[PDB]
């Protein structure tokens, strides 16, 4: 539901599932061109330190 | 409760379905047996299970109706010949309607019928099957979402790792 969950998983792991399509790969590339998501990161589960509970 | 399949319709819907089945069976029997239509209507009026493989049933009760039907058994053999042509049309259904290439046919985890069902949606090669999605392959009831996902993943792996043997 959140793009943080998309950034938590690798692009190779998403490419190993056929739920994404060929045009969806191009859309994912267009989204990752801004380098805000799908940059190959690893989170704790959800929250960064700036994302703190208060 | 009865254990057998049921169909629910209206009475006028029953008459409409009987008229549609009558017209379809009359057109099929006229195309397959080469007879007149005015006699075909009067024959299919009394005919139970109007015209489909009824030669195994006793056709001597049709001699109680008016007219002679001596040569029609030979027409049944002609129907068999037409069935052979129909079988050739089934071969056309294998071949003429977007037959799958050697890459799609030799893909592991898919049979000839599954390859034909996948290639019936415009695809021809394994790369074309990889271009299709799970939702696009879900239109065919023969393939399930997990099976279409596995086939798409296998085709994408064959396309991506084709450099390695």
The answer to whether residue A22 neighbours chain B at the CB level (below 8 Å) is: yes
CB B165 within 8 A of CB B150: no
Encoded tokens for B71: 């040569």
Which one, of B74, B85, B34, B43, lies nearest residue B61 by Cα?
B43
Residue A48 to chain B, least CA–CA distance (Å)? 33
Deposited resolution, Å:
3.6
Domain B112-161: CATH superfamily, name plus number = 5' to 3' exonuclease, C-terminal subdomain (1.10.150.20)
Under an 8 A CB cutoff, do A18 and B131 touch? no
Q: Which residues of B touch A (CB under 8 A)?
A: 130-131, 133-134, 148-150, 152-153, 156
Cα–Cα distance measured from residue B31 to residue B23, given in angstroms and rounded to the nearest whole number:
12
> Comparing B14-92 with B112-161, is the CATH topology the same?
yes
B22: left (phi over 0), alpha (psi -120 to 50) or beta: alpha
Encoded tokens for B73: 């058994």
Cα–Cα distance measured from residue B68 to residue B66, given in angstroms and rounded to the nearest whole number:
7
User: Tokens 């996902």 map to which residue?
Assistant: B149
Encoded tokens for A10: 């690798």
Under an 8 A CB cutoff, do B149 and A19 touch? yes
Q: Which long-range contacts (CB under 8 A, 24 or more apart) does A4-9 make?
A: A4/A43, A4/A46, A5/A46, A6/A37, A6/A38, A7/A37, A7/A38, A7/A39, A7/A41, A7/A43, A8/A41, A8/A42, A8/A43, A8/A45
Side-chain-facing half-sphere of A7: CA atoms under 13 Å = 17
Under an 8 A CB cutoff, do B148 and A18 touch? yes
B140 Cβ partners below 8 Å, 6+ apart? B117, B118, B120, B121
Under an 8 A CB cutoff, do A18 and B153 touch? yes
Which CATH number is correct for B14-92, 1.10.240.10, 1.10.150.120, 1.10.150.20, 1.10.287.110? Answer: 1.10.150.20
Which one, of A26, A28, A21, lies nearest residue A6 by Cα?
A28
Encoded tokens for A53: 């509970």
- The domain spans of chain B are 14-92, 112-161
CB B130 within 8 A of CB B155: yes
Burial category of B66 from C-beta neighbours within 10 Å (exposed 0-12, middle 13-18, buried 19 and up): exposed
State the method: cryo-EM
Give first-to-last CA distance, chain A, whole Å: 21
The answer to whether residue A19 neighbours chain B at the CB level (below 8 Å) is: yes
The answer to whether residue A42 neighbours chain B at the CB level (below 8 Å) is: no
Encoded tokens for B91: 């071969």
């Amino acid at each position: 539901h959140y793009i943080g969950d998309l950034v938590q998983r690798t692009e190779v792991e998403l490419l190993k599932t056929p739920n994404l399509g060929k045009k969806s790969l191009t859309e994912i590339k267009d989204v990752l061109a801004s380098r805000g998501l799908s940059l190959g990161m690893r989170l704790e589960n959800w929250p960064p330190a700036s994302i703190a509970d208060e | 409760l009865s254990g057998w399949e049921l169909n629910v319709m209206t009475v006028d819907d029953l008459q409409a379905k009987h008229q549609a089945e009558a017209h379809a069976a009359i057109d099929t029997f006229t195309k397959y047996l080469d007879i007149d239509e005015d006699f075909a209507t009067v024959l299919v009026e009394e005919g139970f299970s109007t015209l489909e493989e009824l030669a195994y049933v006793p056709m001597k009760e049709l001699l109680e109706i008016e007219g002679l039907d001596e040569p029609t058994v030979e027409a049944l053999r002609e129907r068999a010949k037409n069935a052979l042509a129909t079988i050739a049309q089934a071969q056309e259904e294998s071949l003429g309607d977007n037959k799958p290439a050697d890459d799609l046919l030799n893909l592991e985890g898919v049979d000839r019928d599954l390859a034909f069902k996948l290639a019936a949606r415009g695809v021809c090669t394994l790369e074309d099957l990889a271009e299709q999605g799970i939702d696009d392959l879900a239109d065919i009831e023969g393939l399930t979402d997990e099976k279409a996902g596995a086939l798409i993943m296998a085709a994408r792996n064959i396309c991506w790792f084709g450099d390695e043997a």
